[PDB]
């Protein structure tokens, strides 16, 4: 059993509560597995939209959250109330918002094969145009992703909408 024996999930989440809040916010359950199994806590709000080339499964175990989406060219919202499950199709742009402390969401993804890239995008609050997109071969979320977000927040040029000129807040 490469990934160990079964174990009690609510107790695991309790024992990792200190990591399910800022600044960490999430915790992957097993390492080096094909299924990426993560528990995401809160609070955490964010402005980036994720373009995942594969599906994402959600089961909101504790508390409530919601996903800001782009669907059919329009901004939409999918609520993840406590007890909700949800399967997100590939490439649907989503921005998870997790307002509640003590919340916990099971999120399951697949490891991306080489050449299958993730995208992270920001959109203009004023005119809705795409402001900035980075594509990334996502291997370790811990090292591959934070610098991406920091480099966007640090640069007015990256944050500048090419259509209406308004600078994204970061």
């Amino acid at each position: 059993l490469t990934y160990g024996a079964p174990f009690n999930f609510p107790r695991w989440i309790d024992e990792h509560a200190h990591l399910l809040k800022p600044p960490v916010g999430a915790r992957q359950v097993w390492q080096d597995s094909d299924f990426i199994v993560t528990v995401v806590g809160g609070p955490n709000h964010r402005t980036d939209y994720h373009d995942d080339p594969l599906e994402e499964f959600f089961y909101q175990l504790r508390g409530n959250a919601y996903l800001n989406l782009w669907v059919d060219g329009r901004r939409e919202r999918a609520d993840l109330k406590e007890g909700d499950i949800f399967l997100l199709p590939p490439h649907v742009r989503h921005s998870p918002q997790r307002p509640e402390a003590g919340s916990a969401c099971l999120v399951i993804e697949r490891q991306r094969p080489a050449g299958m890239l993730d995208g992270f995008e920001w959109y203009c609050d004023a005119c809705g145009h795409l402001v900035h997109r980075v594509e990334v071969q996502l291997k370790s979320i811990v090292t591959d992703l934070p610098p991406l977000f920091e480099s966007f927040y640090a640069s007015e040029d990256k944050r500048r909408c090419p259509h209406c000129g308004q600078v994204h807040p970061g």
Copy 2:
């Protein structure tokens, strides 16, 4: 949203309770998705071991179950007590036993690509030798799998251990 909006999982399981028992026993949540998301009920005991070429994730939401395994050449058992999660590595032979009525287990698998075959195996209760193995391109569990099991149960020749000659009970 190809797969619909989020929805309350405990209520979904309640509304499908009549299918989480014999003769059906399980119910896939979404169709035509890359992630195969199934709720498995009970009671159900079985004698076949599954050789899945990809991982299997378990979260035992209601009631208790256990997996009979082969691990390092020996017969073992992994208990899925209520609240347990578990990630099974590829190819570990497993035979789920679900003794309890009203139990419900979330099981998540991946659709197998072409050329990646599942195996289903039976082992001799007397000498532990492999009795029969069928490999299958698993596309629809509903049509691809029941005839496999029936053809094994119907044939003393398939059930006959090639090492000690004892006929498997089916």
